[PDB]
Design a protein around this nucleic acid. Structure first.
Lengths: 97, 81, 57, 105, 95, 48, 97, 86, 94
DNA sequence: TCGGATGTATATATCTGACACGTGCCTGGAGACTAGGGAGTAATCCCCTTGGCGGTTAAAACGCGGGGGACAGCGCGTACGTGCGTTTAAGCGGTGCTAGAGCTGTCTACGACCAATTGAGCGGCCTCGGCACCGGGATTCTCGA
DNA sequence: TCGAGAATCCCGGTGCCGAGGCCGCTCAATTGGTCGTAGACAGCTCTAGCACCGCTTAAACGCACGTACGCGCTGTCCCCCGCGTTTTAACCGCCAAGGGGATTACTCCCTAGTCTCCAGGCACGTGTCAGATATATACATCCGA
């Protein structure tokens, strides 16, 4: 019958994930994604492994920066819950679209 | 030939990147918008990587090509090559 | 880097210390503006309104 | 016996000035022999593109001599030239006419 | 008592061959002059960094082509690549 | 942040943070000048 | 006794200013501003005029881009009136601070 | 002596229809009253970060006048490329 | 047997043991410091070469390197690195 | 729904002063040669990439139940447009003068250029301590009353 | 104002494999000369910038002033979040087969460089028309009753 007040697990996971560094997305689905969208530019390539790790690091850092600027937007609109008009606002302001 | 792998990015993994971003509470459309933005960024990198690989006549995309493409983008990844 | 490596009680320097050593400083963060250190992580930062507060009793 | 390389290739932009700018510019040790021709072609094409989208706005707004406002609109109206000229402040420019649709009464 | 590297007469002739009955002012001529210089510097510099990356010591047509395919966006890139290849082949065949 | 880095921060900034001046309460007292957020370190009470 | 409903003069000035191109800030106060803050780096310089015009064009374009991204923020927060926390949000997101 | 350069104003010299006028070139309907001070602050920051590089090239060239090419070169470094002065 | 490649590993070892007595370093940190020094070298040499083309000279002196460092580094770090450079050159001369 | 009552593109007459166009002349851009050195091409070997199969399990998937933030509705007066009147600094002609930018010989000394020499620096191969893991007590907040 | 309780940080054992170091051995850094031209410098213009001046007038500031909407408050509701139970593919560890990438050796033919000659671009003096400016003028459209 013991359950937390909602939000506590959220904040402790925030601290638990900021106190560590690792690859965060599971590696083989991301590798299959990279090969599948590299199909369209030159058929039957041959990657190395370190290039795939470099892509995973670049994409992970880009998503983290995007979500922090999204969270700034959502706190600015006197809300807490992130809605995708925040993300579209952030990529409209930053200049990528 | 492959399929469906853009859904290989799961539901909790986007939630984990949100938690490292420092985010309390997520809606249900962020998954679709996130897969869209991630696919756009990966196409804009892999185009220039494969362009370098075709110019240097090889059939292999090393880490140095990815770092050269990211140097052109304006992100400048360290720690490889 | 060496100061942070001692102050987390480790012998060597792993790149998390480099990320902390650049992004804690002010001028080196402005130099390394658009740079992602591999295996870096970010600074621990939680906003001011996402955490609860207590009023009664 | 004086056939300029602009005639010998058929283009309009020169190739001797491009060859001199490559050898003087210290970009590399050995300039090739077809690379300044190829680059004169690319420059001629992009100049033709921008002037082509300029002349339409020139005839549409009834003037007959192209002004920087016409150039600003001719660049910014396009989809992919706007991505080419990413952030460039053009002098005497002005902006596109746009009002947000949530302020009309 | 000096000389100057302007591209005024060249943009004049291209404007004659794309619109038979118009002219161009001074300020628009200076904007096109700076535009052509800037595009030239970006393409040449990207080509030169390709030549330095690949441990070779000569800029050729293939490196200028790869600088074009990197720097330009898609449809305009295919147009410029076809124009350049046509110019090179008509240069070297009737050479 | 972990503990000893902020201890270094403490030994840095405890001079510029606070100040001892003439109190209206009783003689003297320790003032405050920099706007402190709820939770940080202020000074180390050190002596013999 | 004839006065407009408020906002009409605003929208017609928006169209009236977007249908034109000129220098918009009066030139001699901006020139005195530029000389006064150039005092601090090297005493008794000597500008030309075209350098001052180039500075005025760069600053005018930067302010116009800043205000349009500010207006996107203020419309995102379900408001109309611009408040300076919008400007500080925009310069926080864009990466200039 | 001979040099009369006691100047205190000219941040107020960017007057107050002027920021309103820039805002209504930008397509802005209704403005508060602190936008004026905030805009003056941001303008001062930007003009400092351009005039610094302009004076650096002017000194390194060993001259006393800041020609237009140096301003174009400073803005070229910043990322805001400017056309139409060379 | 492999073809000999450049690296700045030994010099980072020497500066690290001059500024900390008993603090080692990993591999990944060494690759990061290698790429960092390569970055700073490329930026400063690019700025100096562009100055040399602007001024209608043809020779990189020390003057252009000082100007490039004063441009590219932010403020106080530039005011220390200029002093480091001048002290090293003047100890090199005599 | 209409009248009124605004500002707004719109037909035409005149100028100007910025732009189209001969011209000569020169200096940098076509013609010829010559060597040699960067690059094309064959071959190889050996490194690395890709593919496949079973085993454990950490982790994703998916219902359940709910209560807390998103959102809609409503009331006000603080704050900001709109206009009108009332000052001022901003353009704008002419003037001058002059500090400094730019241009011409003139002569070095400093960096390219090449021959002979060795020690700084990379590669391969050891060894061993910091770090990773296991497991348990102290602590430290949370959540129902 | 409390106490159950569930993670959680601090602490010391067992093992192992990345890091520091040491010898060997090259090949690029060092030294020692010449030799030329890039540049430092004295001098000599002559042209834009800064300061001054009066004069004219668009423009900026102060002040009412009406009003409308940012902000505050309340309600309600539904959907996102903790959590228990259930599958399944991520991963590891492995063997295996072969594509391709650096690498060297060798012709070779494309270009750096030199000498001669001559017209394409450029500075400059022409006249002369594209659009600005001025003046009415039908005509779109904002707002109360």
């Amino acid at each position: 019958p013991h359950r937390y007040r909602p939000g506590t697990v959220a904040l402790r996971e925030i601290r638990r994930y900021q106190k560590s560094t690792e690859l965060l997305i599971r590696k083989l689905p991301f590798q299959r994604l990279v090969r599948e969208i590299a199909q369209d530019f030159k058929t039957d390539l041959r990657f190395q492994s370190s290039a795939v790790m470099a892509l995973q690091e670049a994409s992970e850092a880009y998503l983290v920066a995007l979500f922090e600027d999204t969270n700034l937007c959502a706190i600015h609109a006197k809300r807490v819950t992130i809605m995708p008009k925040d993300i579209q606002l952030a990529r409209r302001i930053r200049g990528e679209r | 030939v492959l399929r469906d792998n853009i859904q290989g990015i799961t539901k909790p993994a986007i939630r984990r990147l949100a938690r490292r971003g420092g985010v309390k509470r997520i809606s249900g459309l962020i998954y679709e918008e996130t897969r869209g933005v991630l696919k756009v960024f990966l196409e804009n990198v892999i185009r220039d990587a494969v362009t370098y690989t075709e110019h240097a006549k090889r059939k292999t995309v090393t880490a140095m090509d990815v770092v050269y493409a990211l140097k052109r983008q304006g992100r400048t990844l360290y720690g490889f090559g | 880097a060496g100061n942070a490596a001692r102050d987390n009680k480790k012998t060597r320097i792993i790149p998390r210390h480099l990320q902390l050593a650049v992004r804690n400083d002010e001028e080196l963060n402005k130099l390394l503006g658009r740079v992602t250190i591999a295996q870096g992580g970010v600074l621990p930062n939680i906003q001011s309104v996402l955490l609860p507060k207590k009023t009664e009793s | 016996k004086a056939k300029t390389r602009s005639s010998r290739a058929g283009l309009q932009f020169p190739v001797g000035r491009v060859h001199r700018l490559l050898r003087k510019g210290n970009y590399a040790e050995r300039v090739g022999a077809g690379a300044p021709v190829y680059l004169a072609a690319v420059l001629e094409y992009l100049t033709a593109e921008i002037l082509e989208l300029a002349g339409n706005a020139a005839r549409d707004n009834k003037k007959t001599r192209i002004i920087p406002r016409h150039l600003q609109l001719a660049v910014r109206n396009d989809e992919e030239l706007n991505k080419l000229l990413g952030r460039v402040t053009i002098a005497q420019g002005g902006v596109l006419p746009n009002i947000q649709s949530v302020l009309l009464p | 008592k000096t000389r100057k590297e302007s591209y005024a007469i060249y943009v004049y002739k291209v404007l004659k061959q794309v619109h038979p009955d118009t002219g161009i002012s001074s300020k628009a001529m200076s904007i096109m002059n700076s535009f052509v210089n800037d595009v030239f510097e970006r393409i040449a510099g990207e080509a030169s960094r390709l030549a330095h990356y690949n441990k070779r010591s000569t800029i050729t047509s293939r490196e200028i082509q790869t600088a074009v395919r990197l720097l330009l966006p898609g449809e305009l890139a295919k147009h410029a690549v076809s124009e350049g290849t046509k110019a090179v082949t008509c240069y070297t065949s009737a050479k | 942040l972990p503990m000893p880095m902020r201890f270094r921060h403490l030994k840095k900034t405890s001079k510029e943070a606070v100040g001892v001046y003439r109190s209206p309460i009783h003689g003297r007292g320790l003032f405050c000048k920099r706007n402190i957020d709820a939770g940080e370190m202020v000074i180390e009470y050190a002596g013999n």
